[PDB]
Amino acid sequence: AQSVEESGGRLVTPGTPLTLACTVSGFSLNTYSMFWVRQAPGKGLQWIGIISNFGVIYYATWAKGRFTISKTSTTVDLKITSPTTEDTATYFCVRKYGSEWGGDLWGPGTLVTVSSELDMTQTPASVSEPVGGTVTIKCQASQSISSYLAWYQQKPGQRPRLLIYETSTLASGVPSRFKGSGSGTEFTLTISDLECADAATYYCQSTYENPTYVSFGGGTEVGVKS
Numbered sequence: 001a002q003s004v005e006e007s008g009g010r011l012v013t014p015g016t017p018l019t020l021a022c023t024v025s026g027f028s029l030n031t032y033s034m035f036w037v038r039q040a041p042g043k044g045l046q047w048i049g050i051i052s053n054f055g056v057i058y059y060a061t062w063a064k065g066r067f068t069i070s071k072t073s074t075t076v077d078l079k080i081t082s083p084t085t086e087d088t089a090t091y092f093c094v095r096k097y098g099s100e101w102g103g104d105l106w107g108p109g110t111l112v113t114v115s116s117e118l119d120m121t122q123t124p125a126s127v128s129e130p131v132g133g134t135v136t137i138k139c140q141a142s143q144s145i146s147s148y149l150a151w152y153q154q155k156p157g158q159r160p161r162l163l164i165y166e167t168s169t170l171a172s173g174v175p176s177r178f179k180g181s182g183s184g185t186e187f188t189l190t191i192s193d194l195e196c197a198d199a200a201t202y203y204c205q206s207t208y209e210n211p212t213y214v215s216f217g218g219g220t221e222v223g224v225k226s
């Protein structure tokens with residue numbers, strides 16, 4: 001069995017550095033690359049950085065200076081250099097999937113409470129359709145990102161789930177009702193024959209392997225009309 005688990009989440013005062021850990025089970029860090037993603041309470045997903053299986057690190061432009069990623073044979077660590085109230089979030093470590101900076105294996109996340117460039121436009125912010133109807137989600141990239149785009153599903157209080165990678169390739173266990181289309185600067189997720197079980201927040205991610213390119217869209221809350 002293959003899984004990932006974060007630990008280290010705590011209440012911290014501003015400026016006091018802390019390190020989160022991510023333990024892996026059923027696979028080796030010498031074979032796989034791991035990345036960190038955070039989510040401020042009730043907000044969107046935000047890509048931090050990645051450590052390759054050979055130890056090469058890349059941070060998203062915003063994250064550079066603010067964090068330090070390190071690894072042992074078993075654990076990947078995330079040090080928050082000088083935490084601020086803006087660093088309050090659920091931190092997830094994720095196993096890299098495929099050829100880009102997308103990921104299929106997520107941990108449940110660990111909570112940090114701090115208390116005393118490519119732009120992805122995702123539309124609409126919220127939408128409901130009838131049962132059996134079709135939902136359409138648009139993602140516009142401010143620069144051409146070719147086919148390096150992933151789609152995720154996140155149910156309230158749950159970890160994100162990979163639906164689609166490479167624009168249109170379905171991840172395992174994903175029903176064909178989910179269709180990814182587009183290329184360049186314009187992308188769509190279509191969810192046909194809508195079910196009450198599809199009610200979740202969906203996110204697009206620029207997966208291109210470059211610090212200035214990797215980014216999540218703001219998300220779309222999808223509901224079903226009763």
Ligand SMILES: [Cl-]
Pocket residue numbers: 011012013016
């Ligand atoms: Cl403290």
Ligand SMILES: [Cl-]
Pocket residue numbers: 098100101102147148149150165166167207
């Ligand atoms: Cl991808």
Ligand SMILES: [Cl-]
Pocket residue numbers: 045046047060214215216
């Ligand atoms: Cl991001």
